[PDB]
Amino acid sequence: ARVKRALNAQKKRRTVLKASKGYRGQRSRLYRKAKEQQLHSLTYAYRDRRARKGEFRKLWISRINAAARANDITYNRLIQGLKAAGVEVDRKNLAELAVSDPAAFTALVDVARAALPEDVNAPS
Amino acid sequence: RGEVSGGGKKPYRQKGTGRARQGSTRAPQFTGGGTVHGPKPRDYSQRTPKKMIAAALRGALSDRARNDRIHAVTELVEGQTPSTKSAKTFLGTLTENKKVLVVIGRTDEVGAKSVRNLPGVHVISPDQLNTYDVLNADDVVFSVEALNAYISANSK
Amino acid sequence: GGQMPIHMRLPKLKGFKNRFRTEYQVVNVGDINKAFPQGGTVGVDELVAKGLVRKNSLVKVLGDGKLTVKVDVTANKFSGSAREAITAAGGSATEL
Amino acid sequence: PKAKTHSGASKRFRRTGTGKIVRQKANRRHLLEHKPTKRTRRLDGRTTVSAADNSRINKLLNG
RNA sequence: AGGCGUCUGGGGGGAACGCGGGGAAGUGAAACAUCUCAGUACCCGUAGGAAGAGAAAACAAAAUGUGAUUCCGUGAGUAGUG
RNA sequence: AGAGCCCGGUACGUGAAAACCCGACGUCUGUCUUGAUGGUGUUCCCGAGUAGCAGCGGGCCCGUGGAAUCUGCUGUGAAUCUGCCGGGACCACCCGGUAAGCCUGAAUACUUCCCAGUGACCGAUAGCGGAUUAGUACCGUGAGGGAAUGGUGAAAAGUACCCCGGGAGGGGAGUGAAAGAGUACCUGAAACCGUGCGCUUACAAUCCGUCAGAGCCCUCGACGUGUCGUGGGGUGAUGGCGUGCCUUUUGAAGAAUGAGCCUGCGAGUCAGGGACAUGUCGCGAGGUUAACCCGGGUGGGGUAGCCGCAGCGAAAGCGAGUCUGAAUAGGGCGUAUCCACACAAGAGUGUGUGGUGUAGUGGUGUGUUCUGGACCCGAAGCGGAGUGAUCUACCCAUGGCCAGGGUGAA
RNA sequence: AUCAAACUCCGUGAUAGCUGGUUCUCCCCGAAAUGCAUUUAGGUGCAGCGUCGCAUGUUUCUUGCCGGAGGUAGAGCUACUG
């Protein structure tokens, strides 16, 4: 029989435009050009979803380093002391505690300093 | 494309025109032209072994007998006087299902001529029994002579 | 690829056809023995009825198998082994 | 339209009982002076075609 | 020969179907002269509702066989030919 | 607004002035009965530039090859029953027939027209080019080419009347179910152009997005003036990241090409008992029907045909063997495959006995392939048949045209 | 309005070893630019390289040890030719 491509294409095109709503220029009015930037947007979202881990870790490390330097001890030595004491709390916890509880941060720093070895330059 | 009218010339020059470079006025790409692969006249006749068809018919009738859907009538209604009301009453008394098949010998006409009008009834001569017809109806009513002729012919 | 291929650069078969051929149809004495337990007289008509050879074709019997039942044989040609087997089986065979 | 069988192939090949394909060897028709005796003797007779080209030949003979 | 008088017939048209002639080039052979395309397109002279053909100077091969012509299915893509 | 019982009609019955054609029943036409039946020996007949022969060409599978038969042309040119021609040159013996004159219905091929019917065929860019002014308008002096244009509603009841206005056009009031039905009239999408509302931007180097992300605004709950919540939405100041799509390319975001946008139209199908391969169903040492008959019907008959049943050998042939060959002497092909039992070397395997015993063939799904143009579309050029010397070239018959002023041969 | 062979209908969907285009989804596996040949080099046949199935299935590969023949790197010249 004779069949007319009426609904099949229009369904996909309606959904494409509905998802694409909110862009700039022709990209939000012309279907043909739209889906290209749809693919680009999805790819960028996929990439930055993974990059988020590194970005948040970067922010947390920066904040912890600032807090430690303010409290008069280096970040590397602080982490070494934490490792020696065997406390497994995470960088996010240290950052949140530092922004919230300076007294607790100072107590932890003192614990780490006490747990530090005698000489960091020893060949051991 | 080769059978529609017109389109015998190259519409214009080849190089220098600058528009789409084309060859014929009724090409499939133009509107109103022919179709690439259009349906063509053909025949759907199919070969089927006689043994296959006979086995199918025998199985159908065997199942109908197993489920007890066969009845035998000496004659439909008093002859020489067609009357649909009597036939309808008799069929209703016999069975109440929507659809039923009635087979009557060729040399008799009154029964068929009286039972033709019922919506759920189909008439068929005993010599043309077929699997589709038996399956379509729920029950089959056999005339005595027709049944005897069929059994004799098939057993011979 | 332009190069003359195998079907182009090989010799032909060796001989001709001899359209005056006269083929027969083979019948096995072992098959006859297996099919005719009680024995007796055999012929083209009953052989065709049993469906051992084509009906219009010429008939010839071969004696590859072993025979142990008396039978009377009517055919068009015979082989030495079949003749000896039939004779030793206490039967007789004739040729048209 | 019934299939066409190539004339040459069916004229230059033969089928055995079980289905193998056979042919004859070439380089024999003429000019065999310098050829020693064992030459033609080995070069005589039939032979089964190599399995490498079997697929193509079978198609030709059947068509 | 030619010329007068009087009767009988014909000049064109029609979508397809037939009969007898004439009759092309693109293209395959990875080219191409032979071939094939094809006796196709087209043309010519022709009538009908159908036409043409038709009453063995026919096959086969030792069977005491068939018995005008026409049209289909097999006979086989085989016996051959290039 | 989906009707067996509202209307048109369907089942069934009837029914014609005139005419048509068919068939059957009636004067008339004509051969024969001046003639028919079975025998015999003798004298005459059975289709002329024909048959045959020689040369040059056609079409039969036969593409001049040994060339049978038929036939076109040119030369030569035969006989009448113990005559003549045919059985692929030809001879002999057999077998069939009687050309050189004419008619002959039935089995078959097709539809410009008319009557009656059908669609797992199309529904206005499809469908015949043509649902309307149709081979019209239009283009070309010619052959010729060749267009787009349906839907108001149940009826027009097509908006009286009043007002703004020249009208066009519009607002009230009425018609009607609707006037979001007002002859531009069903349902009304996208490119496109708007008015109103909310947010944001005038120190900024962006294949224009994403992940974070304050403020503002809208909203759903619980708690009160606004503050949280396993809450949603729009906006986004600001930070990180970030070299379009398809073709063809070893190699490209490219400055290698295609794309203005939008809605439609455009592409691996069909035919054949074809072939190979692969699943599926019956039958089983059988399977299997064409063409054709009888059935409004897909059903029932129809043994003419094709494949396995034994192979080897070019053959005369033979056969569980067979060809090569002087050779049981080795080899090539075959006896389904296997196990067991004996004999050999253990040159790898072969040679002899007994068993289970072999599976092919029709329909059909799917991949490929064969012949038809076979995924889609794309030129310079060839032949056949027709059309143009009103411009442009040349010639033919017949008219018209050249204002004024100098130079001075016989 | 076009002439190193005019224009229209047909043969005609003339034919291309050449340029271009071929659309809905997911699951598994996963290539080559090498050799031979070619009126052959931008074409194409076969081989190797992939996938599915069938049959025998470790026969594939790495390391240790053992039996094997080469004529390079090196080196040498009263050991041959320079």
Add this chain to the structure above:
RNA sequence: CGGGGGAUAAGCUCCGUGCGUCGAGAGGGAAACAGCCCAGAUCGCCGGCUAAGGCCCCUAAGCGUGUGCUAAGUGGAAAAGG
């Protein structure tokens, strides 16, 4: 990597290598840079441990520790020779 053609020239060409990669491969590293170094993407997580390279700020981490050299922005362009 071992070679030929070349002026021991080319981002040149022609060979061999159970050789790597790209081609048919994202991430991180070297500013950008397919053929270099590490490393083989079933999907989600506001979790830990590391190779290559880095730790003055741009930009995450040491203006780290101990022993020596540099007067030239050598560091952050190259040879005969002085």
Add this chain to the structure above:
RNA sequence: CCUGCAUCCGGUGAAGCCGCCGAGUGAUCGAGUGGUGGAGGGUGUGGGAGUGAGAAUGCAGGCAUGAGUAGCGAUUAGGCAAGUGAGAACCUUGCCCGCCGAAAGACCAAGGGUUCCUGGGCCAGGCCAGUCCGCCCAGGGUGAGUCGGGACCUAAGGCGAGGC
């Protein structure tokens, strides 16, 4: 999408379209809900597809920028008073000025067919507005014994009874 079979929905609103709210690992789905509409649709299991677009300097129809930019088709050039009417530099009357005048004038044949006159209006056209028109509407209009042709005669040429 069309179909065999068995079912259910529908003037108490069936088909598309535009939203909200949601849902599946995909091509997407909703017998969950809102506006428009008015006449046929869905599920289950079989059979057949002209069955799925972004690109071929593709084709039919509609619409974007350059753009309210260039031009408004010569070698003469208009001005004034009055009138008509809603509108006048482009229409009518009157008065000045300029141009042509071997033509920018008066006619024949060829060439077109109603462009000629009267009366009506100005949504189509005139490259702008138009009361005007070579716009259209309705009616009317073409008068030969002597003018040009035929009934008078012939050429270059065409047809061609017989015939070759």
Add this chain to the structure above:
RNA sequence: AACCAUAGACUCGGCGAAAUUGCACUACGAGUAAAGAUGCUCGUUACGCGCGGCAGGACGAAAAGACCCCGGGACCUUCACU
């Protein structure tokens, strides 16, 4: 070289045009690559929107390059073939 007039070019009124067009809030110095970057790295400059002018660049627009080669046509010449 200077000056003067005519028709445009300029503002105002009316009608209203075409080629092209993947996208745009389209800088530059030095670099980086298919070896010549508005669209990539570092760095410098730069209020938003318009109008009249100049044309170096945007490999600007025009015709699937005529020059070269491959493949296929056409015409022409002859002691190339038929």
Add this chain to the structure above:
RNA sequence: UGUAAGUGCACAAGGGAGCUUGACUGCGAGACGGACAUGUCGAGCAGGGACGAAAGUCGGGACUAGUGAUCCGGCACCUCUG
């Protein structure tokens, strides 16, 4: 050491001498490398020979180049056909 090079030959494959045509017929267990067909060697059997008393060797030339498919046709012979 016939005909270039290499591999070899001082035991001969260098040369000399006597006899003689195995430069046969019918066969071939198995291997060599090759995409295809072409190419190479071979132990051993039978007939009838050559050399040598015997054991024993001989299916051309110390080895590797001296060549060419298909189709069509000619010539001799044959226990094929007709």
